Scaffold this active site. Structure first.
Site, mmCIF file in Angstrom:
data_model
loop_
_atom_site.group_PDB
_atom_site.id
_atom_site.type_symbol
_atom_site.label_atom_id
_atom_site.label_comp_id
_atom_site.label_asym_id
_atom_site.label_seq_id
_atom_site.Cartn_x
_atom_site.Cartn_y
_atom_site.Cartn_z
ATOM 1 N N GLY A 194 0.846 -1.148 -0.095
ATOM 2 C CA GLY A 194 -0.151 -0.041 -0.021
ATOM 3 C C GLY A 194 1.020 1.079 0.090
ATOM 4 O O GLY A 194 1.916 1.315 0.551
ATOM 5 N N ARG A 195 0.485 2.214 -0.717
ATOM 6 C CA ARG A 195 1.298 3.535 -0.697
ATOM 7 C C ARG A 195 0.917 4.125 0.683
ATOM 8 O O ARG A 195 0.145 4.791 1.051
ATOM 9 C CB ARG A 195 0.613 4.594 -1.739
ATOM 10 C CG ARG A 195 1.023 4.202 -3.084
ATOM 11 C CD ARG A 195 0.359 3.059 -3.779
ATOM 12 N NE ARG A 195 0.384 2.986 -5.151
ATOM 13 C CZ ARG A 195 0.168 2.088 -5.933
ATOM 14 N NH1 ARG A 195 -0.694 0.853 -5.430
ATOM 15 N NH2 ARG A 195 0.178 2.085 -7.249
ATOM 16 N N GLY A 205 5.337 7.660 2.700
ATOM 17 C CA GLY A 205 5.710 6.771 1.566
ATOM 18 C C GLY A 205 5.103 5.540 1.236
ATOM 19 O O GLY A 205 3.951 5.637 0.553
ATOM 20 N N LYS A 264 8.162 -0.288 5.891
ATOM 21 C CA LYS A 264 7.622 1.033 5.567
ATOM 22 C C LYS A 264 9.069 2.056 5.076
ATOM 23 O O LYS A 264 10.102 1.695 5.666
ATOM 24 C CB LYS A 264 7.184 1.442 6.718
ATOM 25 C CG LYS A 264 6.316 2.694 6.417
ATOM 26 C CD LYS A 264 5.614 3.336 7.915
ATOM 27 C CE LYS A 264 4.280 2.658 7.922
ATOM 28 N NZ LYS A 264 3.620 1.981 6.649
ATOM 29 N N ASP A 296 -5.206 6.339 15.476
ATOM 30 C CA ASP A 296 -5.202 5.847 14.225
ATOM 31 C C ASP A 296 -5.723 4.563 14.157
ATOM 32 O O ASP A 296 -5.450 3.705 13.570
ATOM 33 C CB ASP A 296 -3.696 5.492 13.514
ATOM 34 C CG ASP A 296 -3.845 6.118 12.275
ATOM 35 O OD1 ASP A 296 -4.794 6.619 11.602
ATOM 36 O OD2 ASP A 296 -2.999 5.737 11.430
#
Length: 297
Positions: free
Chosen positions: A25-26, A30, A46, A140
């Site tokens: 995943g983007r 980044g 990551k 998050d």
């Protein structure tokens, strides 16, 4: 010992000159990349791309926060240039990935898997807020962010919006980021995060995990129902109907009252006043069978 400096290039090549069909995943500064350590381990690495250093704050993360419902960083890379984080590759990806974006004929989570994701995650969350000093605000919580191991165990992951308090119990004063359907109203109203905004977040994750839906859908808006996943479910009340709200793909595959309780929960958690949301740990009790029915009115 137990924590790993890497020699990048030695990892370029563990991600095959990175990009392309390596992207899981983007990512947020980044990109998440798939990866076979030198041995043949799978790591989601990551990458950084062009404030900052909310880095170090998740390097110095493990040295304050290990629990097994929390993704654990294998190691890292410094260099004068870019910066990356190695987490264990999670065989079965996010709970999200399992709910929207399920490949080939891949099977969807049945109830009890859902049941088990709910508790384990409430679990690592309860650790963060409670058995860490400084306290830790995750910032998050969303299904996208709950990972799954081989035996489909919830691992709260992505520590890249995560703030240590101390600053007694109330709040960390910090710039409102994330996506919409996961922000607590007062958070939104007020700049401050807090164990009580992690809750909120968490409770919305339940609704995801319950529903299939994204917390905020425009698709819904194209049907005169609510773009707001909360608000949709609460068309639960009047229109007395389970069936529609509950993720289509579970049909005969849950029982009525199992799902009620879990909804009751996300609801207790997404309530408007922080004050009345269960602490993450009262959340755990409740998942574990402990005293919901009065916790409400």
């Amino acid at each position: 010992g137990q924590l790993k400096r890497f020699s990048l290039r030695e990892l370029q090549v563990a991600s095959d000159n990175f990009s392309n069909k390596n992207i899981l995943g983007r990512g947020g500064f980044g990109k998440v990349y798939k990866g076979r350590l030198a041995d043949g381990t799978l790591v989601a690495v990551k990458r950084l791309k062009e404030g900052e250093l909310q880095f170090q704050t998740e390097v110095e993360m493990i040295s304050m926060a290990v629990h097994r419902n929390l993704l654990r960083l294998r190691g890292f890379c410094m260099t004068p240039t870019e910066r990356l984080l190695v987490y264990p590759y999670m065989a079965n990806g996010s709970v999200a990935s399992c709910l929207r974006e399920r490949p080939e004929s891949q099977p969807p989570l049945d109830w009890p898997k859902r049941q088990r994701i709910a508790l384990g995650s409430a679990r690592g969350l309860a650790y963060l807020h409670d058995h860490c000093d400084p306290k830790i605000i995750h910032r998050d919580v969303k299904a996208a962010n709950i990972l799954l191991d081989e035996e489909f165990e919830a691992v709260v992951g992505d520590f890249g919006l995560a703030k240590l308090m101390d600053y007694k119990d109330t709040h960390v004063t910090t710039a409102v980021r994330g996506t919409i359907g996961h922000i607590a109203p007062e958070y939104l109203s007020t700049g401050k995060s807090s164990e009580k905004t992690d809750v909120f977040g968490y409770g919305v994750m339940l609704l995801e995990l319950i529903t299939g839906q994204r917390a905020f859908d425009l698709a819904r808006l194209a049907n005169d129902d609510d773009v707001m996943l909360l608000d949709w479910v609460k068309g639960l009340l009047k229109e007395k109907k389970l069936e529609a709200l509950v993720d289509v793909d579970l049909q005969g595959n849950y029982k009525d009252e199992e799902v009620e309780q879990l909804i009751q929960v996300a609801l207790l958690c997404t309530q408007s006043s922080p004050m009345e949301r269960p602490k993450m740990s009262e959340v755990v009790r409740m998942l574990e069978g402990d005293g919901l029915a009065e916790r409400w009115e």
